[PDB]
Amino acid sequence: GADAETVQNTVTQVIEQNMNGIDHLMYMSSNGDSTGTATITLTFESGTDP
Amino acid sequence: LKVNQDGSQVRLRDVAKIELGGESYDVVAKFNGQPASGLGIKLATGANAL
C-alpha cells in the first residue's frame, strides 16, 4: 500500500546507494510500482560468475 | 493523547518537547574545535587507490 513516489524514496534509493561498488557491475535499473513493489536489477559484466 | 473530563484534549506538545535531533548523542565529533561529521570511504577491490 505504498505509492510509486514513496517506494522510490524509501526503498529503491536506499538499496541502490549501497549496491554501488560491487565488483564487475555494469549498470543498474529500478522501478517502483503503485502496488509498492520495488525491483532493482543489477547487470554485471559478461564473464562474471553469477 | 487523552481527552479530559471537561472536554479539553491533551496534545503531545503539551507533555513533551518535539524537535529534530540525531539518532545518538554518545559520540561528539569536532574538527579543530568546530562541529564536524565525516564519512569513511573504503577502496573497492581491484581499484587504483590514487
Side-chain angles (χ1 to χ4, degrees):
Chain A
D3 52 71
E5 179 68 27
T6 297
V7 169
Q8 291 293 359
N9 300 5
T10 52
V11 290
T12 80
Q13 273 189 12
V14 177
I15 296 185
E16 282 184 332
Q17 145 200 320
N18 287 265
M19 284 308 156
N20 289 316
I22 301 187
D23 309 0
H24 307 94
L25 177 57
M26 190 182 283
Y27 52 80
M28 287 187 311
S29 52
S30 162
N31 57 326
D33 322 1
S34 65
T35 72
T37 313
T39 308
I40 314 288
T41 297
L42 292 84
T43 298
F44 294 89
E45 295 177 2
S46 179
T48 302
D49 188 10
Chain B
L1 303 183
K2 196 195 70 169
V3 182
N4 317 18
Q5 290 71 13
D6 65 349
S8 60
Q9 50 193 200
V10 178
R11 256 57 196 275
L12 181 58
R13 67 168 70 88
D14 294 339
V15 312
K17 173 172 307 182
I18 294 95
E19 60 190 14
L20 281 179
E23 291 192 2
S24 173
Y25 296 81
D26 304 358
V27 179
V28 175
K30 286 185 186 176
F31 175 94
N32 287 16
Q34 313 166 205
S37 176
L39 52 159
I41 292 91
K42 294 192 179 64
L43 187 60
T45 65
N48 190 327
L50 316 178

PDB file of all heavy atoms in Angstrom, chain A residues 21 23, chain B residues 44-45:
ATOM      1  N   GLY A  21      29.396  -0.189  -5.978  1.00  0.00           N
ATOM      2  CA  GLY A  21      30.687  -0.665  -5.522  1.00  0.00           C
ATOM      3  C   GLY A  21      30.893  -2.157  -5.655  1.00  0.00           C
ATOM      4  O   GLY A  21      32.011  -2.637  -5.429  1.00  0.00           O
ATOM      5  N   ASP A  23      31.675  -5.676  -7.365  1.00  0.00           N
ATOM      6  CA  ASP A  23      32.619  -5.965  -8.433  1.00  0.00           C
ATOM      7  C   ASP A  23      31.897  -6.238  -9.744  1.00  0.00           C
ATOM      8  O   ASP A  23      30.836  -6.865  -9.777  1.00  0.00           O
ATOM      9  CB  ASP A  23      33.482  -7.166  -8.064  1.00  0.00           C
ATOM     10  CG  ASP A  23      34.100  -7.032  -6.697  1.00  0.00           C
ATOM     11  OD1 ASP A  23      33.853  -6.001  -6.039  1.00  0.00           O
ATOM     12  OD2 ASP A  23      34.827  -7.956  -6.277  1.00  0.00           O
TER      13      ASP A  23
ATOM     14  N   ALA B  44      37.354   0.029  -3.306  1.00  0.00           N
ATOM     15  CA  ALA B  44      36.785  -1.150  -3.932  1.00  0.00           C
ATOM     16  C   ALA B  44      37.893  -2.102  -4.360  1.00  0.00           C
ATOM     17  O   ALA B  44      39.025  -1.694  -4.628  1.00  0.00           O
ATOM     18  CB  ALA B  44      35.930  -0.763  -5.135  1.00  0.00           C
ATOM     19  N   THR B  45      37.559  -3.386  -4.418  1.00  0.00           N
ATOM     20  CA  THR B  45      38.558  -4.386  -4.764  1.00  0.00           C
ATOM     21  C   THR B  45      39.041  -4.183  -6.191  1.00  0.00           C
ATOM     22  O   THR B  45      38.249  -3.967  -7.111  1.00  0.00           O
ATOM     23  CB  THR B  45      37.985  -5.791  -4.603  1.00  0.00           C
ATOM     24  OG1 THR B  45      36.931  -5.985  -5.550  1.00  0.00           O
ATOM     25  CG2 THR B  45      37.439  -5.979  -3.201  1.00  0.00           C
TER      26      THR B  45
END
